[PDB]
Write a protein that binds this ligand. Structure first.
Ligand SMILES: CCCCCCCCCCCCCCCCCC(=O)OC[C@H](COP(=O)(O)OCCN)OC(=O)CCCCCCCCCCCCCCCCC
Ligand SMILES: CCCCCCCCCCCCCCCCCC(=O)OC[C@H](COP(=O)(O)OCCN)OC(=O)CCCCCCCCCCCCCCCCC
Ligand SMILES: CC(C)CCC[C@@H](C)[C@H]1CC[C@H]2[C@@H]3CC=C4C[C@@H](O)CC[C@]4(C)[C@H]3CC[C@]12C
Ligand SMILES: CC(C)CCC[C@@H](C)[C@H]1CC[C@H]2[C@@H]3CC=C4C[C@@H](O)CC[C@]4(C)[C@H]3CC[C@]12C
Ligand SMILES: CC(C)CCC[C@@H](C)[C@H]1CC[C@H]2[C@@H]3CC=C4C[C@@H](O)CC[C@]4(C)[C@H]3CC[C@]12C
Ligand SMILES: CC(C)CCC[C@@H](C)[C@H]1CC[C@H]2[C@@H]3CC=C4C[C@@H](O)CC[C@]4(C)[C@H]3CC[C@]12C
Ligand SMILES: CC(C)CCC[C@@H](C)[C@H]1CC[C@H]2[C@@H]3CC=C4C[C@@H](O)CC[C@]4(C)[C@H]3CC[C@]12C
Ligand SMILES: CC(C)CCC[C@@H](C)[C@H]1CC[C@H]2[C@@H]3CC=C4C[C@@H](O)CC[C@]4(C)[C@H]3CC[C@]12C
Ligand SMILES: CC(C)CCC[C@@H](C)[C@H]1CC[C@H]2[C@@H]3CC=C4C[C@@H](O)CC[C@]4(C)[C@H]3CC[C@]12C
Ligand SMILES: CC(C)CCC[C@@H](C)[C@H]1CC[C@H]2[C@@H]3CC=C4C[C@@H](O)CC[C@]4(C)[C@H]3CC[C@]12C
Ligand SMILES: CC(C)CCC[C@@H](C)[C@H]1CC[C@H]2[C@@H]3CC=C4C[C@@H](O)CC[C@]4(C)[C@H]3CC[C@]12C
Ligand SMILES: CCCCCCCCCCCCCC
Ligand SMILES: CCCCCCCCCCCCCC
Ligand SMILES: CCCCCCCCCCCCCC
Ligand SMILES: CCCCCCCCCCCCCC
Ligand SMILES: CCCCCCCCCCCCCC
Ligand SMILES: CCCCCCCCCCCCCC
Ligand SMILES: CCCCCCCCCCCCCC
Ligand SMILES: C[C@H](C(=O)O)[C@@H](C)C(=O)O
Ligand code: NA
Ligand code: NA
Lengths: 513, 497
């Protein structure tokens, strides 16, 4: 008995090398079964999928596999695979990352978070709602991991202040602790879906949409925001109600208010750099939203059609961060000859942007884009579409429900970005076969791959929440089951009621054929 | 007194007042070409004056080209990751892997043992080695592999102004050496092969150009200009204590200890990367790239394939007895290089720099600026042929500081052929000097990817690179003219037509 356990532990210890070596051997027969080009493309796609799910290699490193394999297998030349990694979607992501780095550099995010928590209240239900709305709004522009990692200390400080008898009161104490510590990552994950720059899978959707359907241009920052933000708010409210119900039982408050006040005043008086960064971020968001909302002609209409994008706007905005002064200019500096000649500092130096930008996610997005390109050009997409004949009789709404459920179940064990990268061509081909708008199935999958609530390995915010040490896997799975159910239902509602008027999903687009 | 105040805010002053100074360019030449020229010059001056960080300037095409109609955003953006950048990225990750395991320390200490810490002997040896290896490979791969040794040596012999001065000089010696070495052979650089192809296209009867003739012509050029550049760099940068240095280097060398498994594994990966780079596709003997589809493979595939091994190959010696030893702990082994350290120690800024350079090239080639320059250079046909070839050499050497060597040679070579035909001079007299000049790129990071690879360290400023580049370009033009007018007349029999 002990020998079997020892052998299992030993083989689990070297899981990465074993899976790396044995995945290609297991995946040889798909090459023989399928036509050469299609078989090789499916082989490399499945190899990347398994490597991503198992984490045999770093996700960014696995994203570089097409460079090795597409030329070797003859799927695509190297000079065509390589440029896929910096499609304009990746310059949009990069502008969002630079803006987020500027926001975190001057502690603007902490100031906004503390202000919202001050405004919302201190009552446990009010505090749950305020912390969730704070994390959701703050993850719309920042990363989910950073938002969770910053909101955890604030929650711990607030609870320590609040709780600074028998079993009822202290059991309520643990219940409130669990509720606060679990409401942060779920809210971060929900709020990441509101904006394209909020999370990577939305940008995966953009890149693979430009790949599979070059003429599709109805998804941008404004349309995605107006579609997802109401859905984000509805899902956040549902999650708040559920979490307060299960945990919150739906002088101390003075102490919590005092501690949050003293935490806010620890930031000192607001700095000129803070106003500059906030105004730049507001201009960034407005310009991205108003570039082309598809129902008021944006400022991109008066320029040359088909030339501008969100990437150019984001890069243009974040360029100003690298030369705008961080100290208030004064005209009297010129006149005062005895004034010091100290060199001024920009709002964001490039060193900070270099060391506070996740280039690994950029490489992952690029790998997804290039894999989509290779799958399209190798003819694997049409092969999958032909093989999907038995599913042509499923009603489109039922198909959306099933694909959302499948992807939301799959994302509980793999990263959201890898999940959507793997599943998006399948959804594209299924939508083509069903004679329905491709976005009507792509967007459900893109949103639902972020519905990772049940496990710590589902999404790094959940990993941080578990690392807080006050949460159990049972609590997270119990909450996340209903979180996934409500998310799927609300997503179906959104895709069947108001996504139709936004993305014009009612009619099959002509560019889909 | 106000001069100090003005100089204190030099960056903002130049950033605001440079577009205004460059406005007359837009109206001088046709608008499609004028806007592209304006963008090119704006980026050049921003790089020279360091008004913006090198990458922020490198991101300028994203803003400029789509707004003024030069090139769509979805066409500008994919240029920042051409396959040339995947070759640079893999070289950077390999250099980081070498640095992490202290293999660079061992290599540099062995080099110091073989040579000594005598000033400028290191720079001469490293320069000649870089040129020799660049003889058969592309300049990009050669400099990408040579920067790790340069950083190793520099970090080793130095453990105040002299230290940084030698640092800058010995780093800048590498891309220049690669550019000098690549022009000596037909296989050294792409423009030579492009010249052969276009010559076969235009002049099938002309067959006096080949590997032997080109070597016997250009090897003296490479040696002469390499020695001249070595003297220039040594003089500008850096002009018994020696026994004590020898001794202490010795004791520290034996205090390194035995070579670890990780060090030799990384060294073998580096050697395999170099060999697969050389043997991928030589133009005199077919390489393993001929076993696959034509033109589907490149140095990027080799670099990424080799570097992928670094992220999973174990950093400790594996033993089969571990499986049988059930009492041994089941602790996972760290790979040769984790992605965290790679992301920490890779200059993505200069990935963006090469990208901006490629965008500049494509914007120039798509806006018609290159064709406009070729057409405007026409009236140079009313000058004696010696002055003609000298002016072609100088204009190409200055032009190639902005465009890549392949791009500029593709632009100018048909112009050179038609100028030679119209002027009634034997074509080679202008074909060869243009091909040699297009390799004379020493002033800007955009000029050639080796310059950006040199910039990778971050201690090298554009100002000193330009300072060396002026004299380097002038000396190259002088030597090329001397070669074409002294011994290239007989080798190619180009004195008669
Ligand atoms: C750590 C543990 C492991 C973690 C792994 C994580 C990822 C798991 C992903 C799911 C499993 C792999 C995908 C499913 C199996 C592979 C697909 C397959 O079976 O393809 C080959 C097969 C051959 O069918 P054939 O014999 O051609 O049918 C007769 C007409 N020719 O084709 C068919 O049967 C036709 C129908 C194909 C439907 C689509 C299959 C691919 C979907 C993903 C594409 C990307
Ligand atoms: C794009 C137009 C230009 C920019 C927006 C308009 C100008 C706003 C004023 C300049 C910036 C002020 C500093 C903002 C800091 C971040 C927000 C914050 O938390 O501010 C708190 C502060 C009020 O509290 P305070 O009085 O400072 O507290 C201590 C003293 N009792 O807050 C304030 O005093 C200012 C409150 C500003 C509220 C702005 C509300 C949104 C405006 C539209 C945004 C559209 C885009 C959204 C994405
Ligand atoms: C190494 C581990 C993780 C791999 C897990 C997935 C494996 C078991 C799966 C993925 C794709 C699968 C293959 C897909 C298609 C075919 C063709 C069919 O005519 C015979 C089975 C065969 C050949 C399957 C065998 C099992 C297979 C290789
Ligand atoms: C000032 C900062 C925040 C930039 C954002 C300004 C917004 C409000 C501006 C910029 C471009 C503008 C548009 C430009 C052109 C047109 C077409 C015209 O027939 C009606 C107005 C309309 C549709 C404008 C509406 C307002 C607009 C969208
Ligand atoms: C737009 C044109 C006409 C004028 C531009 C003037 C610019 C360059 C001037 C105006 C005010 C100046 C600032 C005034 C005060 C200081 C503080 C001191 O530590 C020097 C830097 C710094 C931050 C100056 C930087 C340069 C500055 C921003
Ligand atoms: C949170 C829950 C309880 C509310 C949302 C439930 C979902 C599943 C409901 C609400 C609105 C519904 C849609 C409303 C109307 C139509 C049009 C009909 O021709 C086909 C079904 C379809 C497309 C429905 C599918 C199911 C649907 C999306
Ligand atoms: C920012 C600083 C360092 C730039 C210095 C060089 C600038 C001022 C120079 C370099 C070359 C110059 C151009 C050269 C030739 C012409 C053609 C003439 O018919 C109008 C002016 C115009 C278009 C010049 C404008 C100014 C110019 C662009
Ligand atoms: C340091 C000196 C060389 C200036 C910097 C280099 C650039 C900015 C200069 C060098 C020579 C210049 C060119 C000289 C002559 C002409 C022809 C005229 O009809 C339009 C402007 C144009 C095309 C100039 C544009 C600017 C230019 C390309
Ligand atoms: C020593 C390690 C790194 C392995 C690499 C060895 C190199 C030098 C070997 C291995 C396989 C060889 C190739 C095998 C077959 C052919 C086809 C033939 O028509 C021309 C030579 C060519 C293209 C060979 C060139 C040299 C080659 C690439
Ligand atoms: C090729 C197939 C058939 C077999 C592959 C065996 C591989 C996975 C085995 C063989 C030897 C093993 C190593 C032997 C010893 C150790 C030290 C211990 O701390 C575990 C990790 C490490 C470093 C092992 C990692 C896994 C390993 C490399
Ligand atoms: C800015 C980068 C891309 C290129 C380097 C500067 C270019 C634009 C400059 C350098 C030298 C210049 C040439 C110098 C002299 C002449 C002769 C006459 O006919 C006017 C135009 C013409 C032909 C100029 C055209 C522009 C030119 C080619
Ligand atoms: C170790 C990660 C990379 C493994 C690559 C294996 C490639 C195998 C290709 C098999 C299909 C083509 C046969 C001609
Ligand atoms: C480093 C791993 C390299 C694997 C290369 C696999 C190549 C498989 C295809 C070979 C033939 C291509 C033309 C039909
Ligand atoms: C009383 C209000 C003071 C505001 C100070 C900060 C202003 C920052 C302006 C930034 C503008 C950026 C785009 C040009
Ligand atoms: C239609 C006018 C074209 C010529 C002027 C263009 C000016 C662009 C200025 C860009 C400045 C970027 C750095 C601040
Ligand atoms: C952020 C700076 C933007 C500068 C935009 C300059 C645009 C110049 C060209 C305008 C007309 C384009 C069509 C001919
Ligand atoms: C690696 C050292 C050089 C090896 C080749 C030397 C000879 C030149 C190529 C062979 C053909 C020469 C005539 C075209
Ligand atoms: C040659 C000296 C003895 C040791 C041989 C093995 C050293 C490690 C080699 C790693 C090679 C990795 C790529 C195949
Ligand atoms: C620019 C390019 C060239 O010279 O053609 C690179 C440097 C190469 O050596 O191939
Ligand atoms: Na986020
Ligand atoms: Na997930």
């Amino acid at each position: 008995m002990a020998a079997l356990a020892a052998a299992a532990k030993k083989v689990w210890s070297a899981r990465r090398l074993l899976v790396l070596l044995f995945t290609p051997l297991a995946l040889l027969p798909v090459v023989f079964a399928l036509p050469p080009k299609e078989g090789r493309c499916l082989f490399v796609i499945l190899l990347m999928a398994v490597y991503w799910c198992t984490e045999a290699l770093p996700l960014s490193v696995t994203a570089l596999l097409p460079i090795v394999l597409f030329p070797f297998m003859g799927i695509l030349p190297s000079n065509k695979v390589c440029p896929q990694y910096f499609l304009d979607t990746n310059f949009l992501f990069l502008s969002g990352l630079i803006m987020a780095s500027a926001i975190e550099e001057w502690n603007l995010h902490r100031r906004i978070a503390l202000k919202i928590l001050m405004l919302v209240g201190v009552q446990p239900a009010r505090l749950i709602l305020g912390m969730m709305v704070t994390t959701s709004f703050l993850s719309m522009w920042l990363s989910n991991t950073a938002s969770t990692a910053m909101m955890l200390p604030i929650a711990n400080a607030i609870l320590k202040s609040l709780f600074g008898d028998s079993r009822k009161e202290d059991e309520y104490r643990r219940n409130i602790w669990k509720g606060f510590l679990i409401s942060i990552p779920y809210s971060a994950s929900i709020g990441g879906t509101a904006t394209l720059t909020g999370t990577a899978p939305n940008l995966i959707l953009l890149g693979q949409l430009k790949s599979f359907f070059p003429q599709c241009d109805v998804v941008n920052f404004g349309s995605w925001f107006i579609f997802a933000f109401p859905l984000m708010l509805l899902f956040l409210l549902a999650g708040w109600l559920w979490i307060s119900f299960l945990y919150g039982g739906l002088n101390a408050e003075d102490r919590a208010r005092a501690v949050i006040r003293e935490e806010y005043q620890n930031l000192g008086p607001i700095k000129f750099a803070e106003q500059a960064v906030f105004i730049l971020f507001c201009m960034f968001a407005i310009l991205l939203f108003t570039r082309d909302p598809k129902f008021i002609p944006g400022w991109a209409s008066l320029f040359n059609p088909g030339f501008l994008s969100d990437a150019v706007t984001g890069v243009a905005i974040v360029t100003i961060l690298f030369f705008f002064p961080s100290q208030r200019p004064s005209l009297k500096w010129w006149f005062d000859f005895k004034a010091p000649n100290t060199e001024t500092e920009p709002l964001l130096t490039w060193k900070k942007a270099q060391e506070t930008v996740p280039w690994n996610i950029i490489l992952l997005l690029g790998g997804g884009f290039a894999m989509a390109k290779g799958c399209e050009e190798s003819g694997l997409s049409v092969w999958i579409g032909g093989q999907l004949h038995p599913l042509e009789n499923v009603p489109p709404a039922l198909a959306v429900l099933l694909i959302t459920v499948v992807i939301a179940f799959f994302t509980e064990f793999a990263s959201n970005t890898a999940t959507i990268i793997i599943f998006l061509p399948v959804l594209a081909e299924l939508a083509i076969r069903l004679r329905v708008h491709p976005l009507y199935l792509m967007i459900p999958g893109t949103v639902g791959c972020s519905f990772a609530f049940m496990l710590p390995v589902s999404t790094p915010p959940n990993s941080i929440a578990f690392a807080s040490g006050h949460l159990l896997v049972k609590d997270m799975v119990r909450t996340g089951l209903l979180m996934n159910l409500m998310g799927v239902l609300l997503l179906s509602l959104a895709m069947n009621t108001w996504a139709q008027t936004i993305f014009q999903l009612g009619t099959f687009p002509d560019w889909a054929d």
